[PDB]
């Protein structure tokens, strides 16, 4: 029980959870367990998720996303420091009206990455699945932000960088915290 | 340790009889050497057949296509002999010889299989769409070349090469990749 | 007892266990131990297994599968993120009627993988055992999903990607969770 | 094992017929060798064409520009032949041959795409701005050269090379990178 | 709980926290969690932050800075040993009137550092974002210290070393603490 | 260091005497050289025996089959002499000499054993099921060649090579792999 | 304490122990210590051992086997997942009538593997000891399964793969759990 | 592979017409070779100009100054032609050609930046202050040479070289580093 | 750096005088070279002695037996001279020269020991028993060879080589490995 | 603690130690500390030491042996699985009458191992010390087993494998536990 | 680089004047080369002396003894000159030249010390006993040769060479390692 874990447990006792690294499978499993446990303890209070993440896998992000949506409580997502790639997806996935960006946070939107490795017959399947995943990613981003899927597709072709105010205008977040 | 003196290298003697030896991997360096030799021999005697010996495990696709275009371009007929093995790209080169003049020793094996990626290409999903399209184009080009030089529909070639297919010399003759299986010419044997 | 371990223990008190890594001997041994423990503690309540695995060894997966089958309690399975290869096997192994997939989960069905080494005789023995394993796996998947062995053989040749809805149609899961 | 056969190699014989083989990755060494060969052949017979065989995976930009300037400088015309592929910089070199004298074999491949940094340069932001400006300059220079030698606008080239563009010999001829697609000259094949 | 962690826990119980390494995501997240926890525990007492750091990433430093700004509790930053780049940035960022520098502390101010990697199209975006970050950092240093933005632009070009007295004169610190 | 003495080494001088050396691991690099040498020697004089000295530890299968086909193809008779060892592949090459012209020095040894795949060939089960079939085919072909050249039965050979079989010169001669054990030519002794 | 160790300790309090990795010296020492502890706590209640091992050394496995035999309480061995080499030997070494196999377990039987190094005399000593070890292993396996030693020596020549039903017929197992 | 002809390769041919190729890094080996070539060329005919083709990414400082002294000492006049790029040390050498005989191809590139230490020199503060004094001396020496040869002032050079300065051929001409940008000689384009 | 002279090398000159040189470890490459040299020298003049200098730490058993058979096979008599050392295999070779014509310099050393398998051979017990039988066979064969060439019962050699045995030239002459220990032939020493 | 450490501590509370790896400085110091602590706790009850080691360093083994000799409490040594080199030396060093071997334990007895490096004078010193150590070890082994020093020296050359029965016959152990 | 002149290079010219250069470590390769050179020079003209230039850090012990036996065997008188240093084995070789013709340049160095076992030898005590006895034999032999050639006593050599003893040219002459310290010949400032 190191200092980091001690403080994190203390915060978890106050329904605050963190996402501060790549979205691996381990990080997603930890976050999903935290959300399930918090929901079991109480299904009426909110859960705050702080996002300082440079991105990562899509399967892990989707595990976290489904666990967030299915939880009876409301997940309020605060973008602190950086919300890139999958972190952006999870930030914009928070309960509508409960998505915040700290004033100097930055957000990054771009299309996924991957690799093709096997033979031609396997690369065909990989490419098909890439198309499916990209289409679904853009669909969900457009749903979250309210922008047309065409605009999301055009903007994500390469790294698109947003500040807090630009993100608020776009639709990633509903507020900029200041106090 | 090959026996030669200052240069009577046996490969020099073979080349002096219009024989090119593809005994290594099919890459850019060997490809360029092969095309230089084919052009030189065509210039030396355009109307005398050039012989190619294929004991190679295959290799790159663009190098294969370089060698294939040079073999088809030159004025002289190309006689291919598969000795040992002709696997992957080399198989096409074996089947690309002039019809009739494609041969293999009795214990040679020909391996035909679809193009595969040497490692992982990484990048945005768009770059991967481009690369996957290119790989499909290359595979279809291979099927078409073999269909042209064996007499079989590209669909049959695609079905057969979906997974490694190994053919003895006789099975290669039936498949159309070669035309004759050399018969041993030892004198004491007869 | 790190933070993740504390959370996992608390969930285990709630009869929720996780398979979030590639299945191997160690993960399988842990899962079997937890299944035995939960069955001993109470053999009338259910167990929940959340699967986010990319694959793993067949022997370990079969250990897990036998333990699930023999446990007096009902092992409901949930597919979140990715249930690929052995993970899909275990997901479909859950008690019929209690195999859920989260809306954005993806299932991957494909044939085993292996490696042959040694003399010709050893390779012959290995090929024989590969044939046996392949047959058994296809038969078990056909039993789980309700599909003929021929179709499982056809689709399992290369990677077969199902979304949650296609998985429900096929037979891997019996419900799509949406709360 | 490249045989010999006066004793000479295939490459020496090709050089005697005024043929230069760019079969390796463009870089300083190959660029210098190609420049030396071009100068030598031009001096030997200024009014006779020099043939450049291209089977290369690309290479650097400064080396490409050295070779390009030398090709465009010499008195003699340059006839470029794409053998098995011409990627990245080799595509620019292929398009840099004299109009009417650029050709490819039927199964050749051309690959045009924008300059890509190999690796990373770390430093202060004030140096990274300079590096980025230079990289943009080189990208624009590539687009301008290809526009000049293909008859297309710089904007069209920029749009097309945004991501890897692979062309066959026929698609390259349509694009404007080559003028003819070589025909086979086998005697048996024609007489059949 | 090792000796170092026990000491840090006992200090945190007194509202004293340390920033003693390079500012990366891990330590930034730890500091942010500590600040949130302390602000929750008592939002009327100050938080003492001791800075001995050589630098770090801008996003992590901005996460810490935003947390410091948002917290209801005043934050007093003591520069002990060495405050370089992000260390100095967070040193100047404490509550005006509560920034201190120990007498023999050095303060280093310079412009950011980074790298360009991809293709030309990507490098253009990277360069634009570099300009944005540079301008924002200089704006914030000018706000903290009180100097014109041009002075910060010129002083940060290569490297600027301040002693404690020079730093107080410039504007980073409000007092040189002596006892 | 190998002394020289047109500059010629001992290997070249022996080649001019129609002597070849398989004293290295058999692979494509060595197989192509052996084949070129055999073809050149056949061309120079096809009615004169070619002596091949075998001191190899083994090698690949395709290379063995290339060398074997060339040995059985050229008109000139091949006389194999095993000096230090003839292990695995080389054993076949030793048995492939012309009947009556297979020799081994008294302390030479032969080692026959079934083909082995060092390392792991990974892939789906549907690829390993093809690799196993190819390896079984290779083993059966090795047995058939050894049985054709030793006069035994493919079944007996298969049983005997199940595990490393080490044969001395006399044992090999009794087994059919060689015909005579070279006796020493030293004049002082006799 | 971690999660794995916590659950294993709870099971140990339930007289369930695991052998789920290659049988090396450390694992064998730990397993022997567990058997000793459980025999000390109670000398009548059975000890359940679940085997999911791929093999391992012979000396460590023999340490475990001797501890099992000397223990005053019955050892019931469940073959779950896999039981190869020393795994199958320890599975079959469980008390007769208390050796179980889960339905989808695989049992591999093969002859010992080893290594030879050093001078010729040392190699001769090693070869003689290899013969001794092989003979003892086959004798014990014949005693466990009830097959003649010739059949164990013939079947264990390269790799003998058994399903649960085949293992029951051979004699490695008494019942299959259902 | 650089093809020879009839036994002179292209580099020897260029050397016959008094052309020295600095197409590599400026280090000890290249510096010594270039000194040797310049001295030989001066000996053969002092009253004939010597051409220096530069395609180098620069390098050492002592090697730079050695080549520079030899260039400035030879009785013949040096004409420097930049091909591809002349960056870092090479730029100075390009600027150090005879006034009026410095040339660059149209698409060439010149890079100027102050000397930078490669790696880290560790020591006591005394050794490091000695090293810092030496490095300032080298920087000032480079500034002085460039100011002498380009007609600028040492201060302007210092300010310009604070951060890497990249000049095209025309910009290099307008900066004073070269005298003329070469024009193409092709007749089809005339 | 070995100085040539006008041309040849010292090694070429020695070979012209029928002096093979075994100065490296006895492996397959060295064995093939030595065998080729012996065959060539036998061809040139079968009635003349062939000298073989031995300065080597030993090496493989199969290479040893190849060189041994070739030495015992050619028609020319072999005279071995041990210069710096003859260890393991090279000791057997030293004893394999024609009786009466085996010499060693005064400060040479001969190291004879039983075969040792550096490295580990893994496998099933069924393969290790075969390997052990082979190793015993090769050990016994080396003992038989040394017994034949030194006039000692093979049991004596087996007992003596159980551990590394080092012999000075005189002790080797007493043993039987060599016949005469060479004496210096410097003129100045003889005249003083 | 960890599960392994928990089991080991529980056993140590019953006066059962374990020596299940190569004897080195760390393991020797741990064993000596455990024996010191157990002797302090009570000076009458025996101490059971279970040996499964493959060998190790002489100095560490001699530290353990001295601690065993000086302990007021009797020490009983059980050879399980393997007892090679220093493990065998410590097994035979147990209290005369309390040295047991499990029925399938293997014992090995070979002369010490080492290596020499440095200058000629240093190598001479090392060789002299090697002779001293070898003579001392053979003397102690002869004292433990009861065999004359000649036989111990002769057999100890190279490896001499014993089974439990042959070990009992030789003199390493006093009973085969069953 | 080592320039040639008319054709030959400096080492060949030195050899033609009967000079051998021991400028590398004393190992098997250099030992074999030195012996070959000594024998060739002895054959060419036995009466004339052979000069050995020694500039080496030492090396093996059996190589030392090979070179030493060859030097003491040949019919010619061996003169030795130590140029930069003669450390360990080389010193013995320096002391082993003919009495009267052992020389060293004024600033040469001569390091003599007892044999040392590089690395670590492992094995049973019965093997290390043999190895240590061999090391002692080698040390005694080194001392014996040094005493025989320097005129000192073996015990005094053993005491002195316990630790690294570094002698200058004059100290070596006093010790007996050499006979004369070469005096410069330069005509100017004679």
UniProtKB/Swiss-Prot annotation, chains A, C, E:
CDD domains: S14_ClpP_2. Its EC number is 3.4.21.92. Keywords: Cytoplasm, Hydrolase, Protease, Serine protease. The keyword Protease applies. One of its GO terms (molecular function) is serine-type endopeptidase activity. Its main location: cytoplasm. GO terms for biological process: protein quality control for misfolded or incompletely synthesized proteins. It comes from the Bacteria. The keyword Hydrolase applies. Gene3D superfamilies: 2-enoyl-CoA Hydratase, Chain A, domain 1 (3.90.226.10). It catalyses: Hydrolysis of proteins to small peptides in the presence of ATP and magnesium. alpha-casein is the usual test substrate. In the absence of ATP, only oligopeptides shorter than five residues are hydrolyzed (such as succinyl-Leu-Tyr-|-NHMec, and Leu-Tyr-Leu-|-Tyr-Trp, in which cleavage of the -Tyr-|-Leu- and -Tyr-|-Trp bonds also occurs). One of its GO terms (cellular component) is cytosol. The active site is at 85 (nucleophile), 110. It is found in: Cytoplasm. Cleaves peptides in various proteins in a process that requires ATP hydrolysis. Has a chymotrypsin-like activity. Plays a major role in the degradation of misfolded proteins. Degrades anti-sigma-D factor (rsdA) when present in a complex with ClpP2 and ClpX. Does not seem to act on anti-sigma-L factor (rslA). HAMAP family: ClpP. Belongs to the peptidase S14 family. NCBIfam families: PRK00277.1, PRK12553.1. Fourteen ClpP subunits assemble into 2 heptameric rings which stack back to back to give a disk-like structure with a central cavity, resembling the structure of eukaryotic proteasomes. Forms a complex with ClpP2 and ClpX. This is ATP-dependent Clp protease proteolytic subunit 1.
Swiss-Prot record, chain I:
The keyword Protease applies. It comes from the Bacteria. Keywords: Cytoplasm, Hydrolase, Protease, Serine protease. It catalyses: Hydrolysis of proteins to small peptides in the presence of ATP and magnesium. alpha-casein is the usual test substrate. In the absence of ATP, only oligopeptides shorter than five residues are hydrolyzed (such as succinyl-Leu-Tyr-|-NHMec, and Leu-Tyr-Leu-|-Tyr-Trp, in which cleavage of the -Tyr-|-Leu- and -Tyr-|-Trp bonds also occurs). InterPro entries: ClpP, ClpP/crotonase-like_dom_sf, ClpP/TepA, ClpP_His_AS, ClpP_Ser_AS. Signal peptide: none annotated. It is an enzyme of class 3 (hydrolase). Its main location: cytoplasm. Gene3D superfamilies: 2-enoyl-CoA Hydratase, Chain A, domain 1. It is found in: Cytoplasm. GO terms for cellular component: cytosol; endopeptidase Clp complex; peptidoglycan-based cell wall; plasma membrane. One of its GO terms (molecular function) is ATP-dependent peptidase activity. GO terms for biological process: protein quality control for misfolded or incompletely synthesized proteins. The active site is at residues 88, 113. Its EC number is 3.4.21.92. Belongs to the peptidase S14 family. HAMAP family: ClpP. Cleaves peptides in various proteins in a process that requires ATP hydrolysis. Has a chymotrypsin-like activity. Plays a major role in the degradation of misfolded proteins. Degrades anti-sigma-D factor RsdA when present in a complex with ClpP1 and ClpX. Degrades anti-sigma-E factor RseA in the presence of ClpC1. Does not seem to act on anti-sigma-L factor RslA. Fourteen ClpP subunits assemble into 2 heptameric rings which stack back to back to give a disk-like structure with a central cavity, resembling the structure of eukaryotic proteasomes. Forms a complex with ClpP1 and ClpX. This is ATP-dependent Clp protease proteolytic subunit 2.
């Amino acid at each position: 029980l190191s200092l980091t874990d001690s403080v994190y447990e203390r915060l978890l006792s106050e329904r605050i959870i963190f996402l501060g690294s790549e979205v691996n499978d381990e990080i997603a499993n930890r976050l999903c367990a935290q959300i399930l446990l918090l929901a079991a303890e109480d299904a009426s209070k909110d859960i705050s998720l702080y996002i300082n993440s440079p991105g990562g896998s899509i399967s892990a992000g989707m595990a976290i996303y489904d666990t967030m949506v299915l939880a009876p409580c409301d997940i309020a997502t605060y973008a602190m420091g950086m919300a890139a790639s999958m972190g952006e997806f999870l930030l914009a996935a928070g309960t509508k009206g409960k998505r915040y960006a700290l004033p100097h946070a930055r957000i990054l939107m771009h299309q996924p990455l991957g690799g093709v490795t096997g033979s031609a017959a396997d690369i065909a399947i990989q490419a098909e699945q890439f198309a499916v995943i990209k289409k679904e990613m853009f669909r969900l981003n457009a749903e979250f932000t309210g922008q047309p899927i065409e605009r999301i597709e055009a903007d994500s072709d390469r790294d698109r960088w947003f500040t807090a105010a630009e993100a608020l205008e776009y639709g990633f977040v509903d507020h900029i915290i200041t106090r | 340790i090959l026996p030669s003196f200052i240069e009577s290298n046996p490969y020099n003697k073979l080349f002096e009889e219009r024989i090119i030896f593809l005994g290594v991997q099919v890459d850019d360096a060997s490809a360029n050497d092969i095309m230089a030799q084919l052009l030189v021999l065509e210039s030396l005697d355009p109307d005398r057949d050039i012989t190619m010996y294929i004991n190679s495990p295959g290799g790159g696709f663009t190098s294969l296509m370089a060698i294939y275009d040079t073999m088809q371009y030159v004025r002289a007929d190309i006689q291919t002999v598969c000795l040992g093995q002709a696997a992957s790209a080399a198989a096409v080169l074996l089947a690309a010889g002039t019809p009739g003049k494609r041969m293999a020793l009795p214990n040679a094996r020909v391996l035909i299989h679809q193009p595969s990626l040497s490692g992982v290409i990484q990048g945005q999903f768009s770059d991967l769409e481009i690369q996957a399209a290119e790989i499909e184009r290359m595979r279809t080009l291979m099927e078409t070349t073999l269909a042209r030089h064996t007499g079989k529909d590209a669909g049959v070639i695609r079905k057969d090469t979906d997974r490694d297919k190994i053919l003895t010399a006789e099975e290669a003759k039936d498949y159309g990749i070669i035309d004759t299986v050399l018969e041993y010419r030892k004198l004491s044997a007869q």
